[model samples]
Target: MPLIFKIGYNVIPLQDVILPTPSSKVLKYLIQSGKLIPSLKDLITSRDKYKPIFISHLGFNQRRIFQTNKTITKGSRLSSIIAFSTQANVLSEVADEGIFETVYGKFHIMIESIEIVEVEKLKEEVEKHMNDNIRVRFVSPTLLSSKVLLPPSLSERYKKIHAGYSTLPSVGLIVAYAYNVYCNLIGKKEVEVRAFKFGILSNALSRIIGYDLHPVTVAIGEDSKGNLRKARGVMGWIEFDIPDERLKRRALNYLLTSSYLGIGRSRGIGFGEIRLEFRKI
Candidate 1:
C-alpha cells in the first residue's frame, strides 16, 4: 500500500497570479530536476499521464473563475502539492538538490517555508470523526457525468447531445470513482474488505440527502496547436448520510482521501480538490 504525503509551502508571487500552469506541469517541473527510480518514473511517464499524484493551484482562495478571465486573490500566496509516499522521498533527493525557489507559468513563485501531513498519522486522525453524517465541498471544479441521465444542462441549440455532465452528481458516483482510483494505486489485496464497503455505498450504505452547488465550466489551459481547452465540472457542497455503522467509516475514508488524491478527471492538474466536514452526532 502507498502512503500519502501532503506538502504545503508558503509562496510569494512575483507578478499578479493569473491562471497558473496545470498542477501536473508544476509537479513535473520539480520531478524532472532530479533523479528517480525506474518504477516511479514509469508510473509518471506512462500513457495515463501520471494519475496518482496531485497538485493545488498556487495561492489559496475560493474565488470563482469565468472563462479566460481568472486571476489569483489580491495579496495571497499560499500553495501546496501532494505525492504518494514512494514519490515523497524523491523530494528530499531533489530537495538536497531540489530548487525550492523557482518560476512557474507567468508568475515567479518561491517557497519560503514547508509543512507536511503524512498519512501514517492521518489515518488515526481520520477515524476520530467517524459519524453518520458528513459534508463535502468541491473546492475545485470536479469533472463528473451521469451515464443514465442528461447530466449536463441542456440548452436550446445544444439539445442534440445525448450525454454530457451533471450538476448534482450523486453520492454513489462520487464515492465509487474515489474508491477505484485509490484501489488502483494500492493494488487491492484486501479488495473484499473495501469492495464490500463500496458495494454498500453504491447501494444504500450512503445517500446524498442535501446539496447547495452550481455547475462550473472553466478553461484548464491551452493544448498543443493552440486551442482553448475547457472542462465542465460542478462546484460547491453536498451532504451524505451512511445510516449504517458498518459502512460509515469506509464511506467517510474515500471522501476524505479526495482532499489528497482528488476525485475526478484532471486530478493531476488540480480539478477535483475537496474539503470535508463531519456533523457532531
Candidate 2:
C-alpha cells in the first residue's frame, strides 16, 4: 500500500529562503522532527541505495511571484501543501500533529488528508485507458539524459544528455530506472520493463505542442568557502501524442507510478513532476 499525505502548512520564513522551492532536505528534516517513525527516518537518513519515498515541491495556495533577477524579484509566503509517499505505514505520526519547524522556517503543519492506494488496482484502471492515442504533460521541470562516452575506455566519463521527445530513450529509460529503484527499495519483485528504444511514432504523428526550457539553478550543499552549492536543469512542460497501444501503456505506467518519484535527475531535491490527462484528438 502506498501512503499519500496532503500536508498543509502556514509558513513563516526565518530567512529570505533564497529559493522558494521545497527541498528534500527540508522534508527529511520535517519528518525527522516529527519523530514519526524511527525506522522510516533511518530509511530516509541512511541514504540507502534505493529511495522508496517520493516528495513534491511545496505547492502554494495563493498565486505569488517566486523569482529574483536583475529586472524581477519575488518570493513566497502563506499556505502550502506537499505530497509525500512511502511504502511504509509509519507516516501516521506525521499526520498526528499540526506543527513543524525547519532550519530557516517555521511551519504550522497539518495533515489535511491521507490516502492509501493500491498501485496494482490503479494500474488496472490506467490500463483500461491505454489506447492508440494519448496525451502526457510535465507539470514541473523535467531533466533527462543520454550517455556520450568520452575517450579513455578504462576511465571513461559520460556527459549530461538533455532533450525532449526527440530523445526517445530518455523518458522510458529514466522512468524504468526510477520504477526499478522504487521496487527494489520497497522489497517488491522488480518488474522487467523496457522503455521504447526508437523515436516517438513519427514527427508528424506526435507533436510537442507546448514547452519552455528554463535553465534553473538549485542549491545542493555548501562548499568549503561556505557558498551555496548549485546544480542546473531545464524546467518546462512537454505534451506528447502517442499512436501505439504498447508504447502508450509503457508511457502511462511510467507517468502514473513515477509522477511523484519524478523523471530524469535531481528528483531527490525536487526537479521533475509530471501529469497524465486524456483528451480528444
Candidate 3:
C-alpha cells in the first residue's frame, strides 16, 4: 500500500476586488501607502458590488480530481497499514511507471465537464475520502487566537487555524480547498491535499486565463534588483485520487507558453518547482 499526497497551485482573484483601472490604480496606491490599508470591502468601487471573474470559462460548473491506474486497482486498502501492504502488488508497478513523479506532484486537473447531473455522486465521493494522507488546510498570515480576528490578506489555512468561518475564504480558494478536504474524508488512498500557495497561482492566472480572475491563494514573496524581480507571486495546492500506474506528466514547458499568452509566460522567473513523495503505509 502507498500513500500519495497531491499538492499544487490554483490561483484565482477575489471577485469583488476585480475593479476597473481607475479604481484599481487608486486601490493599488492605497496598498502601497502606510497610512490606510485597503481591503476588499474598503476598495470596491463598482456599484453592483460584484466583479466578473474568468476562472476557466463562463460555461461550465464542474470540479476535477486526478487519479492513477494503480490507485483504482488497489482501491481503499492503500490508505491503511494492515490491508494495503499485504494485498496490493499494483502499487510498486505504478510507481515504477512514474505516475507519482509526473502529474500528481505538480500540475492540477481542470475539470469543467461536471454537469449538474454528476454533482451529487461526486460530492458524496469527495466527502467520504478522509484519512491521514488526504487533508484540506487553509494558509493565512498566522494562526488566529480565541480573542482575535484574521485580516483578509491572510491565507485560508491561517484563517481556518484561527477558526475563521469556512465561507470566509475567497471564492477561488473555496473551490480548491473544498476539493482538497472532500477528497480526504472518503478513505481514498494514494492522494494528499493541502493549501499553501495562492500568490503564484494568481500570477499564473493573470497570464493563463487573463486579468478577469482576481488574484488570491498565491502571492508575492521575494524579488531582485533591476526591477525584474516580481517576488510577490507564489503557488501551492493539494492532491486527491492519484494512482500508482498511468501517471500523466508534463515538463515545465508550459511556463513559457503561459507567459507568451500573457498568463504563465515566465521562462526564468524564479524557483517554481513542484515535487511530491508517496509513502505506503
Scored by lDDT, the top model is 1
lDDT of each: 0.59, 0.47, 0.21
lDDT of 2 by residue, 175-277 (tens): 4455554565445662332222222233324444454445554445665676655545455445555566655665565456565455655455555555556
Off by over 4 Å in 2: 1-24, 34-39, 46-50, 61-87, 131-137, 148-212, 221-227
TM-score (all chains, Cα) for each model: 0.73, 0.67, 0.19
lDDT string for model 3 (1-281, tens) is 21212212121221212222111122133223421122222222323211110011111112211111111221111110000111222222211111111211221122222111122233233323322122122211111111122223454657445443222223223223322222322334333222223222322232121112111222222234433212222233333322211111111111111111112111111111122222222
- The alpha-carbon root-mean-square deviation between model 2 and the true structure, to one decimal in Å, is 5.7
Error of 3 at 56 (Å): 2.5
Whichever of 1 and 2 has more lDDT, that candidate is 1
- Top-TM-score structure, candidate number: 1
How would you order the candidates by lDDT, starting with the best? 1, 2, 3
**Residue 223 lDDT in candidate 2:** 57
lDDT of 1 by residue, 120-200 (tens): 355565577775468888877887655322222343345655566656677766776666566656555444345434653
What value does the lDDT take at residue 237 in candidate 1?
A: 91
Kindly state the number of residue pairs that clash in model 2: 0
